[PDB]
Structures are given as structure tokens and as C-alpha cells.
Amino acid sequence: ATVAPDTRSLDEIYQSALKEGGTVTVYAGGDVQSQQAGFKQAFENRFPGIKLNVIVDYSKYHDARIDNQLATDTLIPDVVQLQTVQDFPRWKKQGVLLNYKPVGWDKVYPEFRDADGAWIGAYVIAFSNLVNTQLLNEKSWPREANDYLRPDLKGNLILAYPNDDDAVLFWYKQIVDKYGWEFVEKLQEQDPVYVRGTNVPGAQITTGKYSATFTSSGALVPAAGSVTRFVLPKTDPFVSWAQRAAIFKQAKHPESAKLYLSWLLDPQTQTQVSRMWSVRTDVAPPAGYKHIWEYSNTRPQAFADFMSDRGAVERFRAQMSLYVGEAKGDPTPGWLGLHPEVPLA
Template sequence: MKEGGIVTVYAGGDVQSQAAGIKEGFEKAFPGMKLNVIVDYSKVHDGRLDFQVATKKIIPDVVQFQTLHDFPRWKQEGILMNYKPISWDKVYKDFKDADGAWTAGLIITFHSVSNKDKLGNIKTPKEAKDFLDPKLKGKLISAYPNDAAAVLFWYKQNIDKYGWKWMEDLMKQNPKFVRGTHVPKNEVKDKNTQYTTTLGTSRDASSQSSTFELPEKDGFMAWAQRVAILKSTKHPESAKLYLNWLIENQGSPWGVRTDKIPPKGYKQIWEYKNSNMKEFENFMMDRAGVESFKAQIRLFVGDVKGEPTPGELGLYPDKPLSK
């Protein structure tokens, strides 16, 4: 509170409303504190942070992004604070930097969400080839894979296993491509939509009609969203408080801590061999490989169309663009 009672977080995401839960939870836990979360695509926020470092006008206290490759570089550049939160020893070994420069704060998983009511007698797709069912033609929706690296990797693992013919056959299904990974799952929940199933989307715990199915034979994907405190922070104790709280308050079904027991029917996320967590990290580290694969995918889906779902936040956003 002596620092001003505020901590500013640049958070990777699709829309500002995705931050509502952590903001409400943190501020309820610590009355008088304000969590100022500013959401934008991770691939935009990371460039913004690099720009702010270059211009010596750094806004956030904390960054939490999907761009896993940035954090080792930022550590090497000396802009991250080495800090090990109270439960650091309980964080899974692959989800933290040895010196505490960054620590994973939450788990995000991508595969497929389907609306059970709209599917009717169509088999709920789980494996990669299930999406090629002729009954699903015109019913699939996806974020542009050349717009979001996590979605890009979801496509890559299927193409690596089944070849480019899988992608060719998928395009014959006339899938719809949109901006924002939240848009497809929102679309399949809409009672008036023609779309029943998403491709490469995070699970949605808020809907009774939608189901998130994990494949048994093929891959899905997951990653541990990395969180770091910046050395430039003017609110170091507030930033530490936030990081401790985030690691203590894990989402469902998976968390970053080894002592968080997943619900019945689930294993720890790192126990799923087909979650491809390490493979995704390696993919993100290979920047030339990412760009090469993105260019090939673009041949199928075309250029990304549409306005960015978080809006245009500018160079130095210090508060959310909208609620």
C-alpha cells in the first residue's frame, strides 16, 4: 500500500474481459489494492515491451505472455527481476527459470470445443481425422493459424503426423477463419450459429452445452504461461504479491504446481505425453521455423482479415482500453 496500492500487468489474451476473473480475485483477496491488467495479443505486447525498453519508458510491473521464447532473451538482456515466490519449490520443474527470472503462472490448453446439442447424431470429433467427417462440412470454425502461434502449432502437430494432405482435406470442409482464439468457442455456443466445432481452441468451463475433448491417439497442446517481474518496476512488493497470489490460486483442471491435484478423470498436465508441452516450447524458440511454417499455412487460409480483438492500444498503454 505504501507503493501506491497498484500493480500493472501486461497480459497476453484476446479481449480485456478475459482478465476479469484474476482482477476480481486479487482485489477481493487484498482490499485496497488495484490490479491493473492490460490485455493484448502476446505477439503485440512483447514488441511493445521491447519498444518501451528501447525508449526507456517501461509501463508494466509484470508481464505474462504466451511468447515463451521472449523470456530467456529478456533474462539475458537483464530486464527481468530474479524472484522466487513462496511456492516456487512446488512449481513443476519445467515451468520455472532456475534463477527465478520467470515462473509459470497458469496452464492453457488448446484442442477442440464442440456444442453437443448442435452436433446431434454427429460423432464428437477428438482425433485429427475426425474433423474430416463429411457431416462436419461447413460446421468448423478456427482462429487464423497464421495469426496466433498457439493455434499455428496445433495445426502443425497434425500436419507433422498426417502430412499436408490432412490440411488439404480439412480445407475441403470449408472451415471459417476468424481473429481471436475466444471467438470460435463463443460462436459454437450461439444458438443461431451454423458452427458446431472449433479447431485449436482453449477449453470453456462456462458452458453446459459445450464439451472440450482430449484426443487419445493424436496430440493436443498445452503451455505454461510465463510470468516475470520487470526490474524497472516502481511497485516491487505489489508485483511480488501478485505473483505469489497467482501461483497460489490455480485454475481448473490444471495448475503449475505439483501439489495441486487435478479433478477426477484428469492427470497432471505434464503426464500427458500427447500434450506436446516441450515441443511447443521448442517450436517457439525456433523463430525461423515458425515464420516458415506460418508462410506455408497462409497458402491455405489466406491473409489474416479483421480488426484485432483487443483493439489498438498504442505504444504506452497504462490502463485497459475497455472493460
């Protein structure tokens, strides 16, 4: 189907969605269910009568889960949203995605949406420096990769496993490109603590157990009283991308899915719920920042290009494994199995 952007108001879509039973099911990529709590609360407050049944798991498990459900005709979710961005052109070509251009589609940065409406970039995520501002004064915030190699940061770093998350991995890819394998060798001499779940480094830095990490997302607008700060490099690369979302052709609740995607693109959602950059050209960067496509030291398309060559990703991942070891510990979302219909209890 050839479609035009939805011309309905959010409330008009909501009236249609209400007739579908009161729930929309989203398989969302992430580390822990709480990372989507803010979206769920905001959505459900905005739309009484419709539950956002968002279920969080690592994107590399959700995409497999979806492929298997499609193979076995047991598809559960209405919507998929993941950082494994290469899946979306593949699912599109497979014919399993509903072409839908949500409200505001015309204002999305072209790179951040499919031309036919098969998928949409929902919001921007970036991985870079997160520092404890009480442990480190501003003049000593590590911002470039090699700052993390200075003597006083030995034993004070906590890092997400790069062999457990390809967005984390891509940070290392860009840095090895620039500084060589020697960076990775010297980094290990800092006795970093590696953990699964990209939420965990920020959590432990917040409680003052570690001082900094260079592969974390975070609020561009810190809360008053915050003891952490997301800080971009002055010159070194950082990782960024638009999290991709799509509606399945055979979704049981298509209008509820449309409501969800249109709500995600709404300027208020983009500025007050999403905590980093917007995918829209008519939404102002938070004061002090530029649009994500205006930074010379990141390139969201580069992450997409990276993710499209699985052999190249695999070969780089396995080499990183030899430096950091196998990814220890349980997966942070818990084990959802083949057919989760609700979040883990």
C-alpha cells in the same frame, strides 16, 4: 541476485504492497480484456486496496511493445505474462527481469520455472477440441484431427487463424507432422470459417452458430447447464504450455508484483480461478484428468522449442497462410499503441 522462495504469507506481502500506492500493472497476453476479468475480480476481492491493472493484448504485440519501451526507456508495466515463451530467457539474459521466487516456488514443476527466479509458469493453457454438446451427441464429438473432415462437419466449423497466433499454429505443426499437408488441404474443403481471436470460436459455438473447433482452450470443469465441452483427443496430439510471467527489474511496484505472482501460484487460485491445469505438483488434477506432464500426446516443452526457432515458425506460418489466406479483420484486443497504461475504453 541469488534468491530463495518467498517465505512470507500472502497477507504479509500484501501489507508491503499496500505501501506502493494501490496498483500493479500487468501486460497480459490474450485475445480480449474479458479473458482476464476472472483473475482481476478474484485478486481485487482478495486484496482490497490493490487494483490489478491488467491490460490484455496479443502476446506478439505486447512483447514488441515491451522491447520498444525498454529501448526508449519508457517501460510501463510491473509484470509481463505471455504465451511467447521464448521472450523470457531473452529478457533474462538482457538483465531486465527481477529474480523472484514466489510463495510456493518449490512446488512448481521444474520445467515450468526459471532456475534463478527470472520468470515463472503461472498457469497451464491447452488448445484442443471444444464442442457444442447440444448440436453433437457424445458419440459424434470430433476428437481426432481427421474427425473434422467427415461430411457432416462441412460448414459447421469455426477456427482461429493459425497465421495470427503461434499457439494455434503449433497445433497445425504437430498435425502436419503426423498426417501431412493433405490434412490441411482436405480441411479447407470443409469450408471452415476463420476468425482472429482464439476466444471467438468458443463464443460462436456457445451461441450455436457452429458445432466444433480443434484449437480452443476451455474449462476442464464445465459449469452445470453449459452447452460446450473441452474434450481431449483419444490419441492425436494437442497443444499445451505454461503461460509465463515475470517482474521487471525496474518495476515501480515490485512488492505488488510479488503479491500478484505469489497469489497466482496459490493452490486456491490454481484450482478455483485458473480453468485448466496447474503448474504445481501438489495440486490435484481435476477429477478425471492427469497432470499436464503425464499426457503422452502433448508436450509443453515442444511448444517452447518450437517458439525458440523463429525462422522455422515463420516458414511454417507462411505456408499455412497459402492455405487459409491472410488473417482478415481487426485485431480483437483493439489497437493499444505504444504506451497503454490502462485497458482500452
